[PDB]
Amino acid sequence: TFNKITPNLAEFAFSLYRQLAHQSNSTNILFSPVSIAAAFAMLSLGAKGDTHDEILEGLNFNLTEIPEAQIHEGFQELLRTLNQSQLQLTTGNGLFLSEGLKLVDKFLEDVKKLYHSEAFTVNFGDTEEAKKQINDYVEKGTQGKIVDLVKELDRDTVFALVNYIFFKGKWERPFEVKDTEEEDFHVDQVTTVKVPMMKRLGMFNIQHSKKLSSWVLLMKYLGNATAIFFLPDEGKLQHLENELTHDIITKFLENEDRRSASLHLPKLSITGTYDLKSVLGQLGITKVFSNGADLSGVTEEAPLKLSKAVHKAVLTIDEKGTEAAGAMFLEAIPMSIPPEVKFNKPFVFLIIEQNTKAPLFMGRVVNPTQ
Numbered sequence: 001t002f003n004k005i006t007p008n009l010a011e012f013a014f015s016l017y018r019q020l021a022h023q024s025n026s027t028n029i030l031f032s033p034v035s036i037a038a039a040f041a042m043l044s045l046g047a048k049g050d051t052h053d054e055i056l057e058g059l060n061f062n063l064t065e066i067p068e069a070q071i072h073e074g075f076q077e078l079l080r081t082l083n084q085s086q087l088q089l090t091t092g093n094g095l096f097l098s099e100g101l102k103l104v105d106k107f108l109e110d111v112k113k114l115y116h117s118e119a120f121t122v123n124f125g126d127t128e129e130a131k132k133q134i135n136d137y138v139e140k141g142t143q144g145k146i147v148d149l150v151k152e153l154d155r156d157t158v159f160a161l162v163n164y165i166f167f168k169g170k171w172e173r174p175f176e177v178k179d180t181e182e183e184d185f186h187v188d189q190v191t192t193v194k195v196p197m198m199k200r201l202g203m204f205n206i207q208h209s210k211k212l213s214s215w216v217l218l219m220k221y222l223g224n225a226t227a228i229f230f231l232p233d234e235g236k237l238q239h240l241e242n243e244l245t246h247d248i249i250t251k252f253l254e255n256e257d258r259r260s261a262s263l264h265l266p267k268l269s270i271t272g273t274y275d276l277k278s279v280l281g282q283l284g285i286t287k288v289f290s291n292g293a294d295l296s297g298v299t300e301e302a303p304l305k306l307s308k309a310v311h312k313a314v315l316t317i318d319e320k321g322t323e324a325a326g327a328m329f330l331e332a333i334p335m336s337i338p339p340e341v342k343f344n345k346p347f348v349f350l351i352i353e354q355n356t357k358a359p360l361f362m363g364r365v366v367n368p369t370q
Helices: 004-023 032-042 049-058 070-082 106-111 127-141 237-243 246-254 276-282
Strands: 029-031 089-098 117-121 159-168 181-188 190-211 215-222 225-231 259-268 268-275 309-316 340-343 347-353 359-365
Touching: 004 029, 004 032, 004 246, 004 276, 004 359, 029 268, 029 309, 032 049, 032 070, 032 159, 032 246, 032 309, 049 181, 070 347, 089 127, 089 268, 106 117, 117 127, 127 268, 127 309, 159 359, 181 259, 190 225, 215 276, 225 237, 237 246, 237 347, 246 347, 268 276, 276 309, 309 359
Parallel strands: 089 117, 159 309, 259 340
Antiparallel strands: 029 359, 089 159, 181 190, 190 215, 190 259, 215 225, 225 347, 268 309, 347 359
16 A cells, blocks of 8 residues: 555654754744655665665665665655646756766666656856756746755855755645635744634544544645644644654544534645755764765766755645636535634644655644744
């Protein structure tokens, strides 16, 4: 029912998330476990030795157990599913290599075949123009959604990696725009701010979890994906974050039971931008960014390290995700008081690709206006 690497990606998702959440309980979090992991597993094709092994271990692959071919086969199938589609996910990874380097052909080939990805040569002698060309690539690829991604380069940069994802999904069962109104969002136990709040009375895949002390909502998107939202009980955000597991999430995803509920969900447009050298360094991925990097799969003659690595994720949630008329359907709603479930205080979510079950996004909203 799942890709061989899905459990690893879930662990990586939680490792990275918990790292961000450990530092700050006031920040929104948004990133793609999948896009980041695929960017580094792609990179590992050009790496050898400890350089190579740290990357894959830092992505939660135990190399004593999982053969490398299974890793790359895993990613190749997952990325194929994302490029095939009503989902209209946009994800891209660009490698930007000094045009003075003699590049190994097999690497350029592998980056194409396995990772459906792009390698470019640039003149890092002109720092500003290199930055422009990198940022124009990302801008072009996001049809303008992501601008000025890279703000600066080290003067000694010879290799940069930029990884982006943008998604605005379309609910299978959408909200009515007429019902969206400004509501309070409880940023803390004594403070609110106003946000646009969508609402619907409907038959939802929704339940309360005593294990997680949270409400758990699953909503399907058109195309191959599902959003799962977790609404912690009062004072239980940290508990929620600590108790998530792959096996718990999998059991939610397996449940198809629906019950009536009055759902309030904010209309969101949120982003996360991360320096991957910093964030993956804390996960143990260090050598590839250091002078001792073994990237002889990329270039044989010359020293090479990854100078710059950036991720940016953008997610939009709204009523429909499209101007198009939806498929018409009727839900039978019982004559009984539905629970009111309001995503009007900090919550956690994941977005899951349905064929593979892989975690396309993981995030937290603590303030929709940050």
